[PDB]
Design a binder for this molecule. Structure first.
Ligand SMILES: Nc1ncnc2c1ncn2[C@@H]1O[C@H](COP(=O)(O)OP(=O)(O)OP(=O)(O)O)[C@@H](O)[C@H]1O
Ligand SMILES: Nc1ncnc2c1ncn2[C@@H]1O[C@H](COP(=O)(O)OP(=O)(O)OP(=O)(O)O)[C@@H](O)[C@H]1O
Ligand SMILES: Nc1ncnc2c1ncn2[C@@H]1O[C@H](COP(=O)(O)OP(=O)(O)OP(=O)(O)O)[C@@H](O)[C@H]1O
Ligand SMILES: Nc1ncnc2c1ncn2[C@@H]1O[C@H](COP(=O)(O)OP(=O)(O)OP(=O)(O)O)[C@@H](O)[C@H]1O
Ligand SMILES: Nc1ncnc2c1ncn2[C@@H]1O[C@H](COP(=O)(O)OP(=O)(O)OP(=O)(O)O)[C@@H](O)[C@H]1O
Ligand SMILES: [Mg+2]
Ligand SMILES: [Mg+2]
Ligand SMILES: [Mg+2]
Ligand SMILES: [Mg+2]
Ligand SMILES: [Mg+2]
Ligand SMILES: [Zn+2]
Ligand SMILES: [Zn+2]
Ligand SMILES: [Zn+2]
Ligand SMILES: [Zn+2]
Ligand SMILES: [Zn+2]
Lengths: 362, 363, 362, 362, 363
């Protein structure tokens, strides 16, 4: 007759839910009969159907509790605590491995009998992405290594190029591939600290569309983004720990996460450039655009900016020995799944269509 | 022992989709008095009241004696907020719009029903006026809805541009109500931008109303910082990466910023920002639209032409049932029949004619 | 043995008290014996004498409570909840009607045997005000219609004119007549949202003495008031709901209230002028000035700036039919009272004195 | 059957944990059976394996508590209280000695049969660092003396030089060697006090990469860092106590900690220079760069920027007599360990390789 | 019983004048261990500890098991702050100074006693060096004290002005400690200005350290807003009307701002601001003072010349017993006798001579 706080926490931990309202909403859905539950029968959400039955009894009681929010708060704090421990005790490679396993879990479902994704359309995204930059699978691989090694002053990559050249598309994919947050430093430096606070315990960070000053010649608006980053050298450096605040108060002193900076060809101060271990210049390509025009599903289903598309790319191009030993078995399994559905020629055909700019699946 | 049921208050909040603690408190306290001698119920007036007073009388009676009224309402409101959060993350955007349409249809059943106070004839007149605001108006609205539903990266915002009193706000307000969402003001100092932007959390779409730019001294347009601010929010408009929205002195949600509309006078738009606008609609003042209104005061007095319900009526009247979500098609059919029963093509065409003539829409 | 929270709430509701400290102070007065209470017998304050005896028992216990503030907070929240429901469920005319009934209650007392107001001095105020603008009673009537109708983009009146021309006097009187708040937008926009939040659930708002820039010619100091208003087009239009915040405890998305803007002949951008349905230009008048010099009570007793003076004006000049059906019976009573105390010539004599610049009651 | 708050506090005290989420996370790991706990048997984390068995019983109960965060807060407050007492009552040498003992504790594990660190790779770091500046071990020794003596207006050292000259590398190592915080004063003054509040109860502080002006000729971006420092003369002097704040959390009036300032050779006002007892000019050296290119582990494992590398350097170079009496015996043990691991010539070869610009362990 | 005594904790805080919740928490937790073989008590390291461990052992043992440790300490600290508030409003300014002197003398009794670590000879050397910093130094200090005690409207602030390293901070810090008070920094933006000012609540005096002005760019002096900020705080320096000091998101106290000192380099001072300064002392660098220190490092290493105890020792050595408050006089006489037996006039004069010669003060 008493709610089990521990069970709510268990559910939060199992789904890695660190959103109090989301947790509250999800758990309240379990208060209803699992025997007569359509959400479970239709297998709509794993975070729901894989847990409804076990949590039914506790949820029924939870529904009558007067401290619902408080209970969920402790549950979420436990998830945050776990993330804090992992950030301090796991190797960065282990962190990425956990991320990859979560993505593979989503893949098993989305490409399984209860999924609505078409593996063929996703491989088409892999094809398009592999035409965006030279040796794309190596670019992605080298990025992962850079993020994992997290070497002082060799932690950031710069994505520079004209409008609609693919900077955000790839940055977004990489961000989802590794896990992390996108930060906006173009806003006033007043609320800057709080924006930077979002990076606490994150694997990596992406400073999106940072604006500079000298660029009115190229019809580029001026902003303080670049000046702001140049005032954050100890953040990009990753040598000394910085002081992040995320709760209207100082919450954590830590090495700032490594990451990416994307921008529109503004001038970059040498002091800031020294923080970028690699710079990639993106170039708009007619065929990529024309291909997208006839391959609308790549944007509508958000495939080319997905970390899942990048993960598939790695599974298709990279040798098993490069992946963490603990996950290799699972990788081999997906390599076999892919070979059984896409011959080399078929994939080559997709890339061909991209270069020709004529519908990837044509 | 006569203990108030928190679960019952929560159920009431859920059924009325009440996410306002004070509103919830005020409403529940009304169920405190006898259901028998209640003018509110017998005279109808408010569904959120008469459809629940009897069922909640007993619990409300106890609630009236509680020393934790606000706390109880808080948990009820949090449950409603939690449901909104789950839906924003788990429903398809089409399902979201469909839920919104069903809510509007519920209001329409009442307002145009026995206990209602609306005159369908006056609302259809609103449809007529709106159809003369832009070319192929019903297609403009349909295309807008698909854009909002598809939520395609960097192809999610429509720009409404034009002179004072050309219809930008009228249509934006109507679409905002049709889909559900919030209107944000980014003309205010960025020192409070995050707080305004935070209002977008869990919203279907957003409207950046009357954004001011620079270099507008030509058309006597006062300069402002709204355009510069939007250009600093490219990741918000793009909808590719999740943004960090703050609420209550604390970041409460990392999410893809909602798609939407930007309305503005004729200021210059930087290339970087223009790239985030999939479509631009140029609004133009029309004497006959003005003259028609002067003789059709009820359209403004009853807030009909700026209403999402007028647009829903338009969609029902013009679009094929097949274009609507499968789950609400039969409901759309009942309305098409209701409308066909109420108005012949001639009666409606006369309304559009009067509008084009700058005369009172009716008669 | 224990205090009845509901009783404190009933007192708050009956007195429409939404000020926690005022409520606390008032209820504590009821803890004393009422038998020989002079506040009661001399009927000094209705908020006191109509309730002391009834609340004595509960107040005596309240005085020994350890949660006085908390009890009154729930009471005030109930009052605020009622205002919230009313703002969303009553027609705007019903809102105005409720306000008029509250003013009439105050009038019943003021001009009653236990009141200290002289109805003749107040009618003198009506006379003076009726000489401030042409067809004043119609101006007030039209203003009320404008506020009730609350038509999109046709909701604000602009009071413009030189120093001491009567702008504030009339705006203050109208504010009290309808109920609402006066907002100062001449201060930094940084703390502007705070001020805008006071408009939550208000019937109308008055932006007092807004300063512009083009005014060197008239020795008028520059300010940001006009630019600030111009950044609030969606607030003035009243088409879409805006987002108001009343500190970290009461946010609200609602249509901004309609109202008034008063200013000193500064330049007004065409974009801002488009939000004003009517502009009234006030002019200083020597006789109005000379009259007041000889009718000091009009200022000392704050009569010409009172909503009660305007309500008396409407009662004297307007046809019963123009008032809401439910209040007409009461308006008739007051029309009879005014006719009993003032013949047409006696009232006309006050207007004569005003026009001639002499003591209104000469 | 009720959780022991004192035991959680003891665990926090033993691990010197002043991070509520970290504490919560670590203590929750103890709720699981330890009998066959691999984290324990494999001895992966001292903070875990040295306490799991002892805290299992209390932790199993804690897991069922509804006040987990509150329990952890009292525990963390105790750790913060202990640090506050220590900062006010211990001599600065005792503070440093306590830090050295904590570092030595980590060293016992790192280089132990259970550790993962290779003493050879760490001594290679000592060799590289010893080539960074002339008489490096004396530079570190003198720095320690300056920090311990904490002499008014003779407590800050300025590291100045071009990009990638070793300023941050050495400052980061000295910061970890002594314990303290790295502060960023390049950001706006708004949250300047927030950043400065981080210095509360810290042994020393490092103002990293302070931006100045008048450096356009050097292609150095302008900033307000130097200007900000010049407005903090009372902080740098350490004569009067200053007032530090951590929001509505922890406030404190204390003498500001002594420390380091690193910068890119901008101009320094005489007023500011007067607060720097010593200025070290760093210079890029081709061989140091070449050596690192062939000794990547020094950066990948963050060895040259480590306080442990510096402590090993002091142990190797400095006479036992210079260390605090209470720690001398432990220093002797380490000097014996090092002498056993490396002969004078074997260590000299490492320095030889660095000077030659080749792999340190080549 | 099994319950902690909050009253005892408060008593401990009151006796140690502890207004730091964390320090109080840390200190009381030390009493939970057996007093029997406590090393801290036998070694007589900290009075705040060894003089109370035995008495509080029992209560502390129970306190160690409490779940409301911080709450208990907060009530104790609040009591200390309440006492401070009462004293600020009800004691004469002389009594305030007297209580401060008595506290310093208590510290002197220990530091110069059998369990102390201070060398009276080294501190007397500090008096010697300081007496060489300005003409008639003992009279300067005396006059300063009278100015602070009298607290006369618009005659409450002294201005210390001079070049770098001339002794401004050295003397200001010593006087600050001698009288008790706070040092404020007004060179930082006025955003957090109200917060720094709040630090002066209930303080005897305030020191505005190193205030930067405009101009003076002719003497390599970086310009700042310090002076402009002080000129905007005229009602604070005047001390005629009460000002409103904020502390923790709210103006926690309306009071006469305390009197004090302002130190600065050679920047220009507006006449409006100069009018709040009753006395201006111009400090000047002296080679011999510098050379003396180079050969008397302990004066800086042990923070002697910047100490309030050095100035109290100076007053004791130079000032007539009659100048001290009646209540402390007998105590002052004891110290005068202690000093005379420790140092003959020629021995002290020799110290001043050495300073003047730029040689080690001692020997
Ligand atoms: N190299 C490319 N060539 C042609 N079209 C591209 C290329 N990359 C992306 N696109 C197209 O442009 C869209 C947006 O790309 P994206 O957001 O990555 O650009 P950036 O991030 O390249 O540009 P911006 O500076 O405006 O942020 C994609 O949705 C796609 O249709
Ligand atoms: N195309 C039009 N032609 C003539 N009158 C119009 C038109 N559109 C709207 N109006 C009239 O002008 C009023 C204001 O319209 P609306 O708020 O939509 O304009 P905008 O939003 O067009 O202009 P603004 O730039 O001032 O915000 C309407 O209430 C209506 O009376
Ligand atoms: N039309 C008028 N003619 C002469 N005197 C007037 C007039 N109107 C108001 N006054 C005088 O001015 C006072 C009120 O002015 P307010 O109504 O305060 O002026 P504004 O609001 O007219 O001027 P301001 O621009 O300074 O705010 C009255 O108390 C009265 O003495
Ligand atoms: N004296 C040196 N000579 C050659 N290379 C060096 C030297 N010092 C450091 N480096 C190399 O440069 C990198 C960065 O050094 P560090 O962060 O200490 O420089 P700063 O702190 O010297 O420069 P910045 O002003 O950019 O912060 C090191 O990781 C190393 O590879
Ligand atoms: N009059 C003096 N002549 C020579 N040296 C002095 C004098 N006063 C102080 N010093 C020396 O200079 C140091 C700093 O003095 P202090 O902090 O008081 O100067 P200011 O406060 O005089 O200068 P600043 O403007 O830099 O704060 C002392 O520690 C001491 O070594
Ligand atoms: Mg982009
Ligand atoms: Mg508009
Ligand atoms: Mg006025
Ligand atoms: Mg550096
Ligand atoms: Mg100084
Ligand atoms: Zn289910
Ligand atoms: Zn009812
Ligand atoms: Zn009474
Ligand atoms: Zn274990
Ligand atoms: Zn002891």
């Amino acid at each position: 007759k008493q709610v089990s706080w521990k069970l709510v926490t268990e559910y939060a931990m199992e789904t890695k839910c660190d959103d109090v309202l989301l947790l509250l909403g999800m758990y309240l859905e379990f208060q209803y009969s699992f025997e007569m539950c359509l959400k479970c029968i239709k297998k709509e959400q794993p975070s729901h159907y894989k847990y409804h039955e076990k949590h039914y009894a506790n949820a029924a009681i939870f529904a009558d509790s007067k401290n619902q929010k408080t209970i969920c708060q402790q549950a979420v704090d436990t998830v945050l605590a776990k993330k804090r421990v992992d950030s301090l005790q796991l190797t960065r490679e282990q962190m990425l491995t956990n991320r990859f396993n979560d993505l593979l879990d989503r893949m098993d479902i989305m490409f399984g009998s209860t999924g609505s994704a078409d593996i063929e359309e996703w491989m088409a995204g892999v094809a398009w992405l592999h035409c965006l930059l030279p040796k794309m699978d190596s670019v992605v691989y080298d990025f992962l290594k850079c993020m994992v090694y997290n070497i002082p002053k060799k932690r950031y990559w710069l994505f520079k190029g004209p409008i609609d050249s693919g900077k955000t598309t790839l940055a977004a994919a990489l961000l989802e591939l590794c896990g992390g947050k996108a930060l906006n430093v173009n806003l006033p430096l007043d609320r800057l600290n709080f924006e930077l606070g979002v990076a606490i315990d994150q694997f990596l960070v992406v400073f999106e569309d940072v604006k500079g000053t000298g660029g009115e010649s190229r019809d580029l608006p001026s902003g303080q983004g670049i000046n702001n980053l140049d005032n954050l050298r100890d953040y990009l450096d990753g040598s000394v720990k910085v002081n992040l605040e995320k709760k209207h108060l100082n919450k954590r002193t830590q090495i700032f996460p490594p990451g990416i900076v994307t921008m529109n060809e503004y001038s970059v101060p040498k002091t800031l450039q020294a923080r970028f271990v690699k710079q990639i210049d993106f170039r708009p390509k007619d065929y990529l655009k024309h291909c997208l025009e006839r391959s609308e599903f790549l944007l509508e289903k958000r495939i080319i900016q997905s970390g899942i598309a990048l993960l598939l790319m790695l599974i298709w191009y990279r040798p098993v020995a490069e992946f963490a030993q603990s996950i290799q078995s699972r990788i081999v399994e997906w390599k076999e799944r892919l070979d059984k559905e896409f011959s080399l020629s078929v994939y080559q055909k997709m890339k061909f269509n991209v270069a020709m700019g004529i519908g990837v699946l044509d």
